[PDB]
Design a protein around this ligand. Structure first.
Ligand code: HEM
Ligand SMILES: CN1C(=O)[C@](O)(Cc2ccccc2)N(C)C(=O)[C@@H]1Cc1c[nH]c2cccc([N+](=O)[O-])c12
Length: 383
């Protein structure tokens, strides 16, 4: 069943706190309860510092960066400092100002397809163009460089690439970003990368390589999950288009509809790894100092004690906040941007192409079982 997340940590079907083996055999406790997952993610005893002995990334590719990771794998003081360099960019009030530009990106992509015959791969023809243009323009990345970055991101997010293969993709990506930090003069004045490089970095608030790290995370984080969420949401539309009547009849409920999609399609499918810094009791288990845990976001998001009939996509749910963007100090810095993109893209394409249906059988879609984040590798649609 590809629209349910239960195949990832099958041990969790039996225990809300399940002992499992990670990619390299390292033991971990997987927490699948909503309240437990929030507890873990907000507790200072569960570290994100990949420099700690035994810290295990959930893929080998990411393991390659554990000795010098970007800020997602730090605790304070570095975490606060490094996130602080770009935090202001991502405040909802600032991101809201980009809504008109985002709406025009969406419109332009749809206009581009207006005379194109189906079937179309809506990942490559819609979701990726929207999401990648949105972030790459925010960042200031030259149009000519975007294909390379796209290839690098795929490598970074692979759950099948080896640790050595991962090290190589990160080198390529890091060398590219480094060139921009050294010489940002061709980048637009109104760009996040130029502001970072001529602001905090010029003011010596973080190093050259830390600057690379911050930019790297925004490229890796900045469109792939958004594009995948758009795509999965279009699978949901194709299967049950009547549920999306909200888009037409009650447009004020679109933000809520987007939240339910983020709950249902928790694309951070492996959950979030943490390491205990001391012995900690949570959810009736004692996690020992130096041992790994996983906060299983997709499962927390289908905890029936919080979300009744959790396997149903239901846009009339009582509103409870999901944990699709994580929780606590690392909670997705990009979440406001993702939300604006989803709110603008999904309704627009449904309005333009309300007859959208899968062009192939659901079982023939290539789901992203081989990536750190879920979605589909291609989404053939007809109308
Ligand atoms: C639907 C879209 C997205 C999902 C589901 C998503 C999910 C996540 C999650 C679960 C985390 C927390 C990781 C942890 O605690 O270890 C995170 C962190 C992050 N997200 Fe996102 N994200 C999305 C969109 C974006 C976008 C659009 C950007 C940037 C433009 C971005 C940038 C980041 C960054 C930099 C972090 C690191 C934050 C930190 O460690 O303090 N994300 N995201
Ligand atoms: C790949 N990825 C993910 O897609 C993500 O699902 C979402 C995300 C993306 C970017 C930033 C934050 C969150 N989550 C939850 C992740 O933890 C890792 C990030 C990561 C983890 N360890 C890393 C080491 C080096 C570089 C990166 N990187 O982001 O470039 C990482």
């Amino acid at each position: 069943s590809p629209l349910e997340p239960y195949h990832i940590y099958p041990e969790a079907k039996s225990c809300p706190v399940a002992k499992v083996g990670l990619w390299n055999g390292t033991p971990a406790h997987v927490f699948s309860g909503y309240e437990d997952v929030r507890t873990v993610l907000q507790d200072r005893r569960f570290s994100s510092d990949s420099r700690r002995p035994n810290f295990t990334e959930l893929t080998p590719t990411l393991q390659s960066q554990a000795a010098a990771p970007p800020f997602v794998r730090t605790d304070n003081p570095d975490h606060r400092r490094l996130r602080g360099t770009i935090a202001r960019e991502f405040l909802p009030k600032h991101i809201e100002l980009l809504r008109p530009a985002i709406r025009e990106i969406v419109q332009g992509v749809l206009d581009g397809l207006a005379e194109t015959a189906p079937p179309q791969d809506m990942l490559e023809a819609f979701a990726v163009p929207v999401a990648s243009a949105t972030v790459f323009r925010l960042l200031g990345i030259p149009a000519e460089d975007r294909a390379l970055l796209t290839r690098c991101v795929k490598g970074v997010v692979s759950a099948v690439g080896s640790e050595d293969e991962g090290a190589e993709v990160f080198r390529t990506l890091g060398e590219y970003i480094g060139g921009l930090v050294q010489d940002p003069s061709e980048l637009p004045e109104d760009s996040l990368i130029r502001r970072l490089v001529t602001g905090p970095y010029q003011e010596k608030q973080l190093t050259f390589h830390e600057t690379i790290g911050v930019i790297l995370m925004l490229i890796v984080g900045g469109y792939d999950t958004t594009a995948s969420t758009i795509s999965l949401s279009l699978v949901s539309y194709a299967l049950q288009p009547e549920k999306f009547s909200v888009v037409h009849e009650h447009p004020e409920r679109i933000p809520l509809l987007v939240e339910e999609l983020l709950r249902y399609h928790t694309v951070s499918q492996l959950g979030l790894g943490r390491i205990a810094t001391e012995d900690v009791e949570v959810g009736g288990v004692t996690v020992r100092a130096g041992q790994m845990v996983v906060a299983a976001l997709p499962l927390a998001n289908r905890d029936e004690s919080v979300f009744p009939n959790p396997d149903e996509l239901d846009f009339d749910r009582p509103s409870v906040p999901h944990v699709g963007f994580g929780y606590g100090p690392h909670q997705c810095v990009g979440q406001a941007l993702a939300r604006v993109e989803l709110q603008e893209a999904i309704p627009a394409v449904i309005r333009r192409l309300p007859g959208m249906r899968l062009a192939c059988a659901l079982e023939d879609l290539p789901f992203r079982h081989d990536m750190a984040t879920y979605g589909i590798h291609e989404l053939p649609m007809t109308w």
